[PDB]
């Protein structure tokens, strides 16, 4: 059933599972036409499919050509997401296929369940957690590969860099969701935090800066301040 604060450690057990977030699949800019009407222009999107235990991120880039000539794109986008996740599962060896897929938005349940009828043993689950995966496009290297794609493409990342060498997957996921929550609440501030000190760099094969354990504690504290702050500037407290 649904995933929530009570069964949170289940994410880091040894049953293969994936989170699927569809919030960046169908992306548009809204603009005025010469006649003074409004139109949309689609831009490249991505499916965010993440193993929370290992950090493996299957980033399926959604090129705008997939929308050409199609109607009801917000609905199609959920079914396209489900088709691509299904194709991903089918491409994995049996022993790498997930036992559970957790969708971050409940409108993905039926599209994914229907595309996975062939996999009766894979549980499709919602969640009550408000996860900040929409902010994935605030990670510069992920945004860059999506916007440069000229065709459909799958790119594989580890969203934890090398963190699992030093911390558990529970702690790495907590760090990831704090970073992403901050980027979602105030992107400018969050990004200022992560890069202010020019001596801390991002390795070519990484997404985030190479912080020492001590510097991560500083960083993490500065993100909780930001999130609390913005919650002030928002609600006035």
């Amino acid at each position: 059933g649904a995933m929530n604060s009570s069964n949170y450690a289940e994410l880091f057990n040894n049953d293969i599972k994936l989170f699927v977030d569809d919030t960046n699949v169908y992306r548009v800019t809204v603009h005025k036409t010469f006649e003074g009407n409004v139109a949309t222009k689609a831009i490249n999107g991505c499916i965010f499919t993440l193993n929370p235990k290992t950090g493996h991120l299957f980033l399926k880039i959604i090129h705008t050509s997939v929308w050409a000539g199609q109607k009801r794109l917000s609905q199609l986008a959920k079914w396209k997401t489900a088709e691509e996740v299904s194709a991903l599962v089918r491409s994995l060896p049996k022993e790498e296929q997930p036992k559970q897929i957790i969708v971050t938005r409940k409108a993905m349940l039926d599209p994914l369940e229907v595309h996975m009828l062939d996999f009766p043993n894979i549980a499709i689950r919602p969640t009550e957690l408000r996860l900040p995966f929409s902010a994935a496009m605030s990670i510069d290297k992920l945004s860059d590969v999506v916007m440069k794609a000229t065709e459909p493409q799958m790119v594989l990342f580890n969203i934890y860099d090398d963190w699992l060498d030093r911390i558990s997957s529970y702690t790495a996921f907590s760090r990831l969701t704090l970073l992403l929550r901050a980027l979602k609440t105030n992107e400018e501030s969050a990004k200022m935090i992560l890069l202010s000190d020019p001596t801390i760099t991002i390795k070519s094969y990484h997404l985030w800066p190479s912080f020492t354990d001590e510097q991560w504690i500083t960083i993490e504290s500065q993100m909780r301040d930001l999130i609390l702050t913005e919650y002030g500037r928002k609600y006035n407290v």
């Binding site: 489900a82 088709e83 369940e113 595309h115 009828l117 062939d118």
Partner: protein, 300 residues
């Protein structure tokens, strides 16, 4: 006109015959029902005065044999039976018509209600849903589960309705997932009508039988089946025009006949609001939408 005689009425019981019903007191001199119209299936049904639990009854067609009811004090119910001996049955029934010990099937001449509720229902198809092949009539009660219910526990006592499941490999063609889920015409027309039911008359027959078992016995799995068969049609963009017109008439008479006080349990709010107001056929059921809106505006 045919007759369903009774040996006796040893226990107080409300007896239904199709959409009619009457009370019989314990050991009252009741010996059955006469003037039953030939040409239709019928249902004779029972609710004991001491235990409203278990409504039960028998589907039958008098063209298929001579049937009578006898109370079994061991199993505690009124049982339908068949008499092979015609001459004896005629001779025993006549004795009763002479002593005026029978109630008359009370059909008003203007009234087509029973025809309109059973137009496509045939005994041969009832007997495939209700498997008990040594009898020409079929027993149904409030508690019997359907084959699909048993998949989600006695198989001999099941209602073998056609399984309908919108998220099933039968319903959804590989590669047409979105198309087939959002527009069920493939499942309705190819899988169910051409494949399983063969024609729409057989589909409507099962739909009508499911409704009648829901209404007369409060059979929950039959109610599920009735709504699923409605929803499969309403959720199909492509339906033969004659089928939509006939469905409108079928449902109209079902909604007309439904007890006003059972609407809360016998009508599924989601299915009806979807069918009448969101589905492909939202504008194709004029008679049904008008009676629903005037009789059950709360549900909507």
């Amino acid at each position: 006109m045919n007759t369903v005689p009774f040996t006796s009425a040893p226990i107080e019981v409300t007896i239904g015959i199709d959409q009619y019903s009457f009370n019989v007191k314990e050991n009252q001199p009741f010996h059955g029902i006469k003037d039953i119209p030939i040409g239709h299936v019928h249902v004779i049904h029972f609710q004991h005065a001491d235990n409203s639990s278990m409504r039960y009854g028998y589907w039958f067609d008098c063209r298929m044999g001579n049937f009578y009811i006898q109370y079994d004090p061991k199993d505690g119910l009124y049982k339908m039976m068949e008499e092979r001996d015609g001459a004896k049955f005629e001779n025993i029934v006549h004795n009763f018509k002479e002593r005026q010990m029978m109630v008359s099937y009370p059909k008003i001449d203007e009234d087509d209600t029973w025809y309109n509720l059973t137009e496509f229902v045939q005994m041969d198809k009832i007997r495939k849903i209700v498997r008990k092949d040594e009898n020409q009539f079929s027993y149904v009660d409030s508690s019997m589960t359907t084959v699909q219910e048993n998949e989600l526990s006695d198989p001999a006592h099941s209602l073998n309705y056609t399984v309908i499941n919108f998220k099933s490999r039968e319903a959804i063609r590989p590669g047409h997932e979105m198309e087939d889920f959002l527009d069920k015409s493939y499942y309705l027309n190819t899988v169910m009508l051409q494949g399983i039911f063969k024609n729409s008359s057989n589909y409507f027959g099962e739909l009508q039988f499911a409704f009648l078992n829901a209404m007369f016995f409060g059979n929950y799995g039959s109610s599920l089946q009735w709504h699923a068969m409605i929803e499969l049609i309403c959720s199909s963009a492509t339906v033969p025009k004659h089928m939509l017109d006939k469905l409108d008439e079928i449902l109209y008479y079902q909604i007309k006949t439904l007890p006003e006080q059972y609407s809360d349990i016998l009508l599924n709010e989601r299915v009806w609001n979807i069918c009448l107001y969101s589905s492909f056929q939202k504008n194709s059921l004029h008679n049904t939408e008008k009676i629903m809106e005037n009789k059950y505006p709360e549900l909507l």
